[PDB]
Amino acid sequence: ENFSGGCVAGYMRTPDGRCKPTF
Secondary structure, X not given: OOXXXXXXXXXXXXXXXXXXXXX
C-alpha cells in the first residue's frame, strides 16, 4: 500500500492523526 504518506493521495496525514482532505 501507500507508505509514502499515510492516507490517500488526496489525504496528507497530519500529526493531529487526521488526513488533510485536499481532493
